[PDB]
Design a protein around this ligand. Sequence first.
Ligand code: HEM
Ligand SMILES: [Ca+2]
Ligand SMILES: [Ca+2]
Ligand code: NA
Length: 306
Amino acid sequence: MQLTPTFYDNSCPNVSNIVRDTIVNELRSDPRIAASILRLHFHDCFVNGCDASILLDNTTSFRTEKDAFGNANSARGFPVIDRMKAAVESACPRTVSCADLLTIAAQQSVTLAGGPSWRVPLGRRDSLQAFLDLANANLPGPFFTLPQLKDSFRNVGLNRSSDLVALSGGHTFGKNQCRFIMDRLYNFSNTGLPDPTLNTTYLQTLRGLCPLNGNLSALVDFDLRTPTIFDNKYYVNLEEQKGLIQSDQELFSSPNATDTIPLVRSFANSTQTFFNAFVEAMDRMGNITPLTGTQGQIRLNCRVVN
Ligand code: HEM
Ligand SMILES: [Ca+2]
Ligand SMILES: [Ca+2]
Ligand code: NA
C-alpha cells in the first residue's frame, strides 16, 4: 500500500497538532529535543525501514536497538515519544502507528527548529521485533570515509548523493560528544596529527572544548553558526572546513567528493535549494521498506509489541 500524506485525515486529523504541541512543550526545558527526535527517525529508517523498531525495549528473545553502537548513550527522547504516543492514543485509540508518529515527530521537529514545513507520507506500521545486529551493521559512523558513507546509504536504499548530502544537513543542529572528534583533534588516522581538513582556527576552539584526556562525553554543537536552528549554515561551515565530524567534512573534502561538493555548494548557496532537497530526501528515507496495509501492527505502547 502506497504511503500517503492524508492517511489519518479522517481517523486522526489532529495527530500532527498533538505531536507538535508535545515537542513545543518539551523544547522549553530541553532545547535539544527537536534534534534528538529527528535523529531517532533516521535511526529508525536505517534499520529495517521506518517501522518503529528502534523504539522497542529489550525482551528475552531479541535485544533492543537502543544498545547499538550508534544508539547506546547517544539516542534520546524516548519518553517524549511515549508522551506524544499516549496523547495520540487518547485522541484516536489504536489508530496511529509508532512508525508514523515518529515520522511526523521528526518533520514537526524540523519545522519547529525553523526548517521546511511539509506533510509526510503516512501509513507505515510497526515492527514485531527489533534489530540490534542490523543497527550495528547499518548505522554509519562519524569516522566513515565518504565511500563508506555512500555505501551505508545505498545499503538501506538511498542511492543518491543528494540523499546523503541533504540528510547530513540534520547536523545543522544538535549535539555531538567529544569522543567522536578526538582523533580529528589530536591523532587522525594514526598520523599523529589533527585532521588536515579541519580549519585550524576551529581546531583550536574544538581542542578547548575537548582536551586530550578530557571528558569524552562532553557535548559540542554540530553547527557552530546556529546550533539550534534548522537552516543551511551547516553547508557554509563545510565550505570553510568547519564540519564537526569527519563524515561531515568528507562531503566537501574527500577525494571521492566530486559529486557531493556541488551539492554542498548548492545547499550553502540557497536555503530554498537545501530545504527542497531535505524534504525530498526525508521523504525518500521515510519510504524505506515500510510495513503497510495489514503488515505489522499499530503498536499501543511504542516500547513493546502488542
Ligand atoms: C551521514 C552519516 C551520519 C553520521 C556518521 C552521523 C553521526 C552522528 C553522531 C556521531 C552523532 C552524535 C551522537 C552523540 O554524540 O551522542 C549524531 C547526532 C545527530 N545526528 Fe547524525 N549522523 C549521520 C546522519 C544523520 C542524518 C541522516 C540525520 C537526520 C536527518 C542525522 C541527525 C542527527 C542529529 C539531529 C543529531 C543530534 C542529536 C541530538 O543532539 O540528540 N544524522 N550523528
Ligand atoms: Ca527501524
Ligand atoms: Ca543551524
Ligand atoms: Na526509495
